[PDB]
Design a protein around this nucleic acid. Structure first.
Ligand SMILES: Nc1ncnc2c1ncn2[C@@H]1O[C@H](COP(=O)(O)CP(=O)(O)OP(=O)(O)O)[C@@H](O)[C@H]1O
Lengths: 200, 985, 212
DNA sequence: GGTCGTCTGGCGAGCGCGCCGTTACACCAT
RNA sequence: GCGGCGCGC
DNA sequence: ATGGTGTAATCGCCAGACGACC
């Protein structure tokens, strides 16, 4: 899967996976989702307190924020980060694009807790437009929102939300007018990863 | 097979030969011969070099020792070794028995004495010494006689080199002694490479502060010179002590030049260094290139080539001089070769690591050997700063800000040029080889190439000798034209330049006149829009100020060179690009430039106007005005007659009158023409007036003209003026009319796109696209050309112009397909052939019909060809070879009639009396170039060249299917161009 | 005011008690093509001083897996120390043409703050700090105008001056001095700036913050 | 590793000449 | 050799 | 005048590689 997954990975190790963390980051918020092999969502969360993108880049503050965010996350066998697809030629995208790489870089260094010994990659990145073409959210060259798709999924469904599903429904009804897309994109990215990579 | 250290040692030994340091090279040779692990690097070339040096010196015992060392090594002696031994025997006379035994031993190895005498790089003196030795041994041996030079027997070039035809070759207007002293001036100017030219910027009055700054500069420069001398002396001492031990060093390379010359070159490089510095590697490369060039120039005065060049140039100047007559008139190159020929030699460059090491050593010497007071202990001037340049980190030599401050204060009024970027003060040497040529002492190249491109000059050196004689002679003839400065135009240009210049005419403005950002009263933090627009205004003002400063710098350089060349006669040598198009060697001041450069230049020799000179001057003036471009010549002359008052007023009062000449497209050339016409009309006899002004005849579009000639298209030729007509036919007006016809048909669909565009069809919209069809423009680029012109005009939509642009591109392309069909057939065939050749893995190569080989250099990063560039460049490059062939034929046949002919591509310039004759030569050679089958000869050459490989037989057949399908010719005869009045006009 | 100078010098806020009681540091200076580091004791002794010059980075794409692999390979050779000092460049987001370098400088540092700062999850205290290069140049008088100049001559004075003189700044051990001089003499035609900046930053940290 | 149908990023008018400059801007300070 | 401009065909 | 300084936010076609088969 060279075109779908950016790091090279063996398919045999891809097939034998238990649960995956899917992480989506934006300028102001982080969201992630813990989803297992049986397509049942174990966790789905986003954080509001960010304290970054205030005009001063500082690696210590980034380290503190990513450490605090990672401390909440449960353990899994693979961490799927998004790929934004922006180009280095566009100057106006410079203040944002840098942020993504920084947030990507630490997320490779902080989450590969055993890379020093074994030398195996536990964190992967998958292309966004492939997910959009799979879910048919691509109108023209730009992906559309996924609020309708996640409302249809949660309300033989692809995702099997559990006892805890009432809390997820309360979160979904909680200020849905707010510009939150990372929470939807993490879940749909996890579903797309489980469909394209380990299935069929 | 050659290691880097082996190249270092070979360059070391060659430099020791050049600097006459044979004991030192002998010491290094024997110390490397002592150790067994070092002898694997040693090569027979090194032994032959040391043998040749000992032979030139005259030491027989050391030579025999080197033979003993070669025998101990076990190598086989080379023929050049025996040639060096014979040279040593000749220089130091000995008994004939030993030399006879040496010849017998050479004969036992199977070597040939003829192979010793010829095809060896040894100089004429060495050959003479070897011949003396052989004559001492065997007087029966003699060299074969020298054959007479071959004559080119090409069909197109037969009339140029025919002895039976009557010839009247032109001669210069200057006597012999004047040309001799001009030669002396040029030699003394080229011996010292730098040339100092007084600036044309208005000077500043010298205050006391500037005089103090200049005195401090002088004292600092004296201390710097002495410190550099001491540092160079101690560096030479320690490097010699290093060479005494068994190690390689750069001592002979530092001994290559005199100490004073090296210190002067380093001081010049220090002076030329900008405020913000340049990369260390760039300075190293410039230092190495400069010291190599100075060695090449200064070696000849020691070896005595300067005196031989002086004598042979003095003998050769009789052909060009007015008061001297040769026994039989001939071409300048043939006269140069008929006399004694000074043997110019191709020079072998040093290896790149040696060059880089020498440059870095000299730059380090400059950094460490220069100190200044801060103004207080001494502090260095130059420092190493790691800074970001381009997208990469690099080291930079940065000067002290006090040095930059003292350079800015008390600004020097002088500028520095090289001896190769200034016009020649003497007539140039004839072009006799791809390497020998125009400049007296500086090395020359026939074809301009990028760095590392040696295929162009290697394919040019394997052709038959006669093939380039058509081109070289033309390149000599274009070099023999004598130029001068107009003078009256230069005064007005300098008057506008030193004051606030007029950018409408083409004179840049001083930085004081540059705009400034508006004053700000509102706080920046009050509104983001206010600070944003202030920042944008500042960033635009800085950019336009930088552009204005660059333009003023270019104008200052050009006008300073022009002022230097005032009241003196100079020659512009010419070379070629990789396709055969000719360009002048001096880049700044030449006739291939803007209005000012073309108006400052006049002919040194003058010719009487004659019966039809004034009319041609008037037609040239009307052509330069541009007011009558679609009118016949008679109406142009009538317009010239009815506007004579404006011409006289402009000539008498260029800047304090009605200023009519400013309304023309080319105002400076227009003013020159008005002055020249004013003097002629006011003369006693208009016919007897002597005119130096060049008159220009141009063609509409050589791309479509040559494509029509190749395809013999009946309807294309009418458009491109290859068929006789009373009124000139413009391609742009015709294509615009066809496009407007197509828009009327659109009434069927009634599209909004058509009806908004109905009024605004114009020649201006389609002119750029039709002139760029020749260069293989795509529909996207045609859109990017049409959309701009739609943007300036106030079209009805003013938006969704994207929809309007695509339809216009499609209709102009359909109209140009119906007007030009054979043209696009030939372009498609050429593109397909280029694609199929590039896919097989080779670059496209073709021979110009005058015999010049052309190879297309585009390649990827033993590299692979760039298929896209090779595919998209062949149809434009092929036409330019045809244009240069016709221009060279016109030059070579105008020279036989005593005509002063110069060319700025597509434009032929000559005296006003000699225009009509040139026009015949312009047309009679167009019919003779295209009478011969160009396309079928090209097809046969391409088949023979690119389809002779036994491998890939299927691909070979696929290539031959396309290559042997030339487009079918049409039905327009090519012999009626001779009656076309507007072919070249 | 002294705390203001240390805040201008050092990016992460570190109390004086931990800065005063250090024992060993590692100074690291990285570039597009090369990285260098030097390890120094409280009594200033260069225990090791090393360079890495062959990278796959800064060749076209920006893939973070290759960055992680290369940084892990470099860090594996590094010994342990109390503090890890990193160089801070003056590049800003305003210079767009220099953005490809800046991106690089922001990726590696992001990994060097992550991989080197072990036990940050438990302890919660910083161990990697960034020091401005202009302040170090001003301390060593290597600043001409606004451009900091090279310090090859100062390092040559530190290394090849075998006389005791009076109060030397840095001590090179007798066992490793020959290899140090060999490395200095080998890279003379091609100047390796990071190898000099690492030692200069180590001395500047041990003088301006420690032993203040 | 060799090959085929495809698809997906990329470049879109040829030669030849030049100049100038390689974080920017208001403050500070003088 | 990489950016901003200008010129000629 | 000079000189240092403290700050950041809408085309549309072509040539070389990708996956399955060998
Ligand atoms: N053969 C050519 N190829 C490419 N560009 C050319 C060209 N001839 C001229 N140009 C460029 O096109 C510009 C405009 O051409 P013009 O100055 O209008 C002379 P023209 O092309 O013959 O139009 P005309 O027939 O109305 O005189 C020139 O200034 C020059 O930069």
């Amino acid at each position: 899967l060279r075109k779908l997954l950016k790091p090279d990975i063996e398919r045999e190790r891809l097939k034998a996976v238990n649960s995956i963390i899917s992480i989506v980051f934006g300028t102001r918020r982080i969201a992630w989702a813990h989803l297992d092999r049986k397509l049942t969502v174990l966790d789905w969360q986003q954080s509001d307190r960010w304290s970054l993108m205030r005009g001063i880049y500082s690696s210590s503050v980034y380290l503190e924020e990513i450490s605090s965010i990672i401390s909440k996350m449960p353990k899994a066998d693979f961490y799927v980060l998004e790929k934004t697809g922006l180009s280095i030629q566009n100057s106006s995208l410079f203040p944002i694009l840098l942020h993504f790489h920084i947030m990507e870089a630490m997320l490779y260094a902080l989450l590969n807790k055993t890379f020093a010994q074994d030398g195996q990659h536990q964190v992967l990145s998958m292309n966004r437009n492939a997910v959009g073409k799979h879910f048919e959210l691509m109108i023209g060259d730009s992906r559309t929102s996924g609020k309708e798709l996640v409302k249809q999924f949660l309300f033989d469904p692809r995702v099997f939300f559990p006892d805890k599903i009432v809390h997820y429904r309360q979160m979904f009804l909680s200020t849905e007018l707010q510009r939150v897309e990372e929470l939807y994109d993490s879940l749909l990215q996890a579903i797309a990863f489980y469909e394209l990579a380990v299935f069929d | 097979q050659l290691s880097g250290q082996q190249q270092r040692l070979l360059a070391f030994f060659k430099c020791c030969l050049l600097t006459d340091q044979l004991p030192l090279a002998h010491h290094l040779l024997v110390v490397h011969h002592g150790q067994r692990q070092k002898r694997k690097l040693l090569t027979l070339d090194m032994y032959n070099a040391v043998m040749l040096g000992w032979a030139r010196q005259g030491a027989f015992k050391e030579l025999v020792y080197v033979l003993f060392m070669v025998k101990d090594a076990g190598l086989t002696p080379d023929l050049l070794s025996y040639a060096a031994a014979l040279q040593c025997m000749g220089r130091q006379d000995q008994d004939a028995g030993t030399i006879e035994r040496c010849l017998e031993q050479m004969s036992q190895e199977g070597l040939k004495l003829q192979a010793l005498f010829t095809a060896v790089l040894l100089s004429e003196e060495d050959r003479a010494t070897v011949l003396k030795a052989v004559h001492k041994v065997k007087p029966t041996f003699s060299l074969p006689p020298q054959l007479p030079p071959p004559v080119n027997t090409s069909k197109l070039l037969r009339d140029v080199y025919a002895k039976d035809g009557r010839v009247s070759y032109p001669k210069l207007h200057l006597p012999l002694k004047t040309l001799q002293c001009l030669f002396e001036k040029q030699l003394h100017m080229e011996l010292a490479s730098r040339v100092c030219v007084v600036s044309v910027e208005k000077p500043t009055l010298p205050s006391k502060e500037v005089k103090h700054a200049r005195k401090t500069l002088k004292t600092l420069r004296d201390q710097w010179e002495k410190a550099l001398c001491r540092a160079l002396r101690e560096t030479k001492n320690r490097l010699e002590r290093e060479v005494y031990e068994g190690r390689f060093s750069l001592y002979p390379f530092l001994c290559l030049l005199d100490e004073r010359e090296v210190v002067r070159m380093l001081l010049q490089v220090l002076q030329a260094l900008p405020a913000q510095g340049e990369s260390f590697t760039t300075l190293a490369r410039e230092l190495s290139a400069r010291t190599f060039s100075r060695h090449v120039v200064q070696r000849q005065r020691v070896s005595g080539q300067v005196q031989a060049l002086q004598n042979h140039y003095r003998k050769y100047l009789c052909l060009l001089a007015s008061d001297a007559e040769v026994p039989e008139p001939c071409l300048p190159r043939q006269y140069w070769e008929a006399l004694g020929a000074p043997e110019a030699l191709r020079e072998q460059p040093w290896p790149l690591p040696v060059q880089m090491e020498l440059g870095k050593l000299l730059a380090e010497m400059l950094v460490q050997a220069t100190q200044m007071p801060c103004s207080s202990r001494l502090v260095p001037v130059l420092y190493h700063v790691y800074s970001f340049r381009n997208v990469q980190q690099i080291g930079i030599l940065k000067p002290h800000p006090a040095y930059v401050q003292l350079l800015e204060k008390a600004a020097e009024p002088t500028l520095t040029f090289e001896a190769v970027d200034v016009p020649m003060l003497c007539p140039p040497l004839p072009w006799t080889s791809p390497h020998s040529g125009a400049f007296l002492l500086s090395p020359t190249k026939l074809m301009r190439t990028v760095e590392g491109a040696t295929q162009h000059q290697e394919l040019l050196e394997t052709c038959p000798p006669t093939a380039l004689h058509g081109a070289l002679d033309a390149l000599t003839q274009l070099g023999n034209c004598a130029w001068r400065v107009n003078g009256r135009v230069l005064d007005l240009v300098l008057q506008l330049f030193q004051a606030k210049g007029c950018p409408q005419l083409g004179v840049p403005a001083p930085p004081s006149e540059a705009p400034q950002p508006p004053e700000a009263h509102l706080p920046h933090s009050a509104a983001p829009a206010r600070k944003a627009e202030l920042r944008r205004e500042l960033a635009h003002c800085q950019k336009v100020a930088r552009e204005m400063h660059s333009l003023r710098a270019e104008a200052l350089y050009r006008l300073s060179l022009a002022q230097h060349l005032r009241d003196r006669v100079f020659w512009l040598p010419h070379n070629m690009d990789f396709r055969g198009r000719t360009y002048p060697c001096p880049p700044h001041f030449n006739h291939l430039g803007s209005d000012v450069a073309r108006a400052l230049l006049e002919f040194a020799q003058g010719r009487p106007l004659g019966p039809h000179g004034l009319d041609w001057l008037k037609i040239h003036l009307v052509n330069l005005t541009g007011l009558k471009k679609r009118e016949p010549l008679r109406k142009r002359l009538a317009f010239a007659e009815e506007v004579m008052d404006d011409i006289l007023d402009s000539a008498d009062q260029p800047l304090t009158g009605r200023k009519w000449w400013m309304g023309a497209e080319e105002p400076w050339q227009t003013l020159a023409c008005c002055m020249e016409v004013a003097n002629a009309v006011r003369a006693s006899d208009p016919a007897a007036y002597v005119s130096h002004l060049p008159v220009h005849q141009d063609g509409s579009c050589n791309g479509l003209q040559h494509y029509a000639a190749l395809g013999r298209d009946s309807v294309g030729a009418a458009s491109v003026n290859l068929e006789p007509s009373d009124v000139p036919q413009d391609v742009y007006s015709g294509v615009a009319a066809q496009v407007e016809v197509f828009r009327r048909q659109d009434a069927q669909r009634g599209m909004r796109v058509a009806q908004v565009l109905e009024g605004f069809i114009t020649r201006k919209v389609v002119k750029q696209t039709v002139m760029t069809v020749v260069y293989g423009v795509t529909r996207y680029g045609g859109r990017l050309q049409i959309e701009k012109r739609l943007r300036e005009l106030s079209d009805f939509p003013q938006e969704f112009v994207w929809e309007a642009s695509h339809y216009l591109v499609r209709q102009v392309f359909k109209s140009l397909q119906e007007m030009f069909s054979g043209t696009r057939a030939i372009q498609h065939w050429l593109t397909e052939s280029a694609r199929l050749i590039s896919h097989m893995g080779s670059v496209v190569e073709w021979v110009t019909p005058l015999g010049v080989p052309v190879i297309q250099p585009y390649r990827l990063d033993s590299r692979k060809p760039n298929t896209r560039k090779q595919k998209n460049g062949f149809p434009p490059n092929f036409i330019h070879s045809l244009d240069s062939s016709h221009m060279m034929l016109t030059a070579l046949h105008c020279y036989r009639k005593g005509l002063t002919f110069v060319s700025v591509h597509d434009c032929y310039w000559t005296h006003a009396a000699d225009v009509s004759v040139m026009n015949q030569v312009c047309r009679e050679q167009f019919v003779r170039l295209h009478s011969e089958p160009i396309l079928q000869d090209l097809s046969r050459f391409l088949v023979k060249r690119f389809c002779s490989e036994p491998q890939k037989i299927l691909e070979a057949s696929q290539l031959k299917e396309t290559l042997q399908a030339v487009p079918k010719p049409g039905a327009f005869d090519l012999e009626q161009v001779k009656r076309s009045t507007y072919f070249f006009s």
